[PDB]
Structure formats: C-alpha cells, structure tokens
C-alpha cells in the first residue's frame, strides 16, 4: 500500500530510469535505481554468446581481472572455439592443398 | 565488508599495519535446535574493508580476546 517516487530529477519512464522497489532496514518501501542489464559479448566469428567471459557493461571490464575477459585457449575472448577449431582445420587444409597445387604446376610446367 | 574464517589470518590482521581500532559484539543466539548460546563477533576496522570473524563457541572466544594485542583500541559491545 506504500507508493513510491523517483529518486532523480528525470520524471520520465526512459531506459535509464528503471526502478527496483525495495524494503529497507527502516521497514518502508523505497525506490532504487537499477542500471541497464549488460549484454553478453558475442563471438566475432559466429555471433553466439561466448562462454567463459564475464558479462558487464563496457567500462566495468576495465575494473576486472583478465581471467574474466579471456579464456585459456588462443582467440580466448574473441571466437567461440568451434569456430576456432574451424580456423584450425581450414588453415591447415588450405596451406596443405596449396603445396599440392604448387606441385601440380611443377608437373604441368615441364610435363605439359 | 568481508567475513573471515581463518583464526590465524585474523591474528595477522589484528596486528596489521594501519589497523588502529577493532570492536567485539556479543549476541544471544539459539544453537542448532534447542538451546541458546553466547555468540561473539570480532570486527577489525581496516583502511578499506571491515573484516569480521564470528567465533561460534565462547571457548575459542575467551582465549582469543587475550590474543588481541594492546594499542588496538577495542570497543567492548
């Protein structure tokens, strides 16, 4: 039955005025301003939300230790690792198949 | 803003550096199922955080109050 008011001079229901309602040690209801829920980062290859990485808003990532912001494998805080596994097979196979094609020139060179 | 388990670490904290003041709280608390018991809380005011140690039984408590050095100004309750 208690009714509550905003705590900041913005009266309007915008993104930045989100309000949690709370009961304090006083025993009364009081508004409290919530920030905007920060979004999980995305693998820059596939786009899926990449695990092992803490999800905060971007200037919070400067206040946190690095074992949050990467994971132990190459391209740790970047790609989703089935996509890095992709970069593994594809790299190797393409750099291999290159030699085959450099060989097969050296055949058709003097064998044409 | 932190709670402490280790009794030893607590001691190295009570003598630590910039810690000029501590405090000790005593609460009536009912043990386990039935009875009451004397709970005692050790609060050490650090330059950043207030570390606090809860000694459940008064035995470890009684001997720890002695473990507190002088020049640490300890408000009793």
């Amino acid at each position: 039955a208690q009714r509550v008011t905003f705590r900041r001079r913005n009266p309007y229901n915008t993104r930045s005025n989100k309000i949690k309602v709370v009961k304090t040690p006083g025993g009364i209801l009081r508004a409290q301003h919530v920030k905007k829920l920060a979004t999980r980062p995305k693998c820059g290859d596939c786009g899926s939300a990449l695990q092992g990485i803490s999800t905060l808003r971007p200037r919070q990532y400067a206040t946190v230790s690095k074992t949050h912001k990467t994971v132990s494998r190459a391209y740790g805080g970047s790609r989703c690792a089935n996509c890095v596994k992709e970069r593994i097979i594809r790299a190797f196979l393409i750099e291999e198949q290159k030699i085959v094609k450099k060989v097969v020139k050296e055949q058709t060179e003097a064998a044409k | 803003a932190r709670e402490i388990t280790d009794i030893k670490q607590f001691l190295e904290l009570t003598r630590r550096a910039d810690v000029k003041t501590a405090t000790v709280k005593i609460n009536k608390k009912l043990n386990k199922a039935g009875k009451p018991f004397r709970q005692t809380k050790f609060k050490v005011r650090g330059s950043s955080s207030l570390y606090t140690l809860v000694i459940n039984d008064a035995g470890k408590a009684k001997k720890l109050i002695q473990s507190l050095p002088p020049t640490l100004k300890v408000n009793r309750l």
Binding site: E86, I89, R90, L93, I94, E96, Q97 | -
Partner: protein, 97 residues
Amino acid sequence: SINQKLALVIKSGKYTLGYKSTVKSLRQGKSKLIIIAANTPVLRKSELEYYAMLSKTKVYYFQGGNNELGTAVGKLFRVGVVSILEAGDSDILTTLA
C-alpha cells in the same frame, strides 16, 4: 546404377553413416571406401579427403544431396558421408570407383 550397388552393400555388407563415425573408420583404417554427398562443405570435403589419403582409402563423390544419398542407403534421414566397412555381395569398389 551407382545407387544400386549401395542397395547390395546395405543388405549383404557392413557400413557406417555420418562424419563422426566415418572419421573413426578412417582413423582405425577399417574403411575401404567412403562416399560423399555433393552438397557437403569443402572444409569437410578436404578433411574427409585428407583423412582418406592418410588411410589409403578411395573416395567417390556422390552426385546429389544428403537427403538423396540417405534415401540411396534406404534410410529415412539425410547422410553426407557413408563409410563402406565390409563390401557386401556387390562388386562395389572394384569398378570405375
């Protein structure tokens, strides 16, 4: 037809279906020949290719999709790669293959 050979391999012979198992075959070498559905991606092609050259297993490219090469084994789903384990009654590998 190249499809009808599989009809015999399937009833009278031994086979496995799908990439994860057709690598296990080529690794253990248990596969004589694997067949690839035309639409499957080239990274998987090169892999299944390169896994085969290391196992000295021939590979024929099925002209068609996975929903077809799956019907061609008489199974109601799609399959990209069939690994031929034990040739059946059919002539199979001794062929154009």
